[PDB]
Swiss-Prot record:
Domain of life of the native organism: Viruses
Protein name stated in the entry: Host translation inhibitor nsp1
Region of interest called Disordered, as start-end residue ranges on this chain: 1-113
Reported function: Inhibits host translation by associating with the open head conformation of the 40S subunit. The C-terminus binds to and obstructs ribosomal mRNA entry tunnel. Thereby inhibits antiviral response triggered by innate immunity or interferons. The nsp1-40S ribosome complex further induces an endonucleolytic cleavage near the 5'UTR of host mRNAs, targeting them for degradation. This inhibits the integrated stress response (ISR) in the infected cell by preventing EIF2S1/eIF2-alpha phosphorylation upstream of stress granule formation and depletes host G3BP1.
Subcellular location: Host cytoplasm
Annotated ranges, domain CoV Nsp1 globular: 2-113
Length: 113
């Protein structure tokens, strides 16, 4: 399937134990896609002071359309030193590995895979 319905645990930035997916744009997009498939991917909502507490490169989910079954359609955009790889809509948040942190909420997304 070109899209997959996921429910992403929303984590508080200060709880996150593994603060990024790796060391290159290509690695973080790779690892983010693998964690999304394996159900081990969390979402941090981006506010003032969040991104400096996470590791670059960043992986964002961004809204790709204006929402089947409650699931917002999203795609992945990476960012390293102020350059983005991908073009998409509004940021729903930054993806991080999930290693058992307790979420505050769930974000239903339809991921362009």
């Amino acid at each position: 399937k070109t899209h997959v319905q996921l429910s992403l645990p929303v984590l508080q930035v200060r709880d996150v134990l593994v603060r990024g997916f790796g060391d290159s744009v290509e690695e973080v997009l790779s690892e983010a896609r693998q964690h999304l498939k394996d159900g081990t991917c969390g979402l941090v909502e981006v506010e003032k002071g969040v991104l400096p507490q996470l590791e670059q490169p960043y992986v964002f989910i961004k809204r790709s359309d204006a929402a089947p079954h409650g699931h917002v359609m999203v795609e992945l955009v990476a960012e390293l030193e102020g350059i983005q790889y991908g073009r998409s809509g509004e940021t729903l948040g930054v993806l991080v590995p999930h290693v058992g942190e307790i979420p505050v909420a769930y974000r239903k997304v339809l991921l362009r895979k």
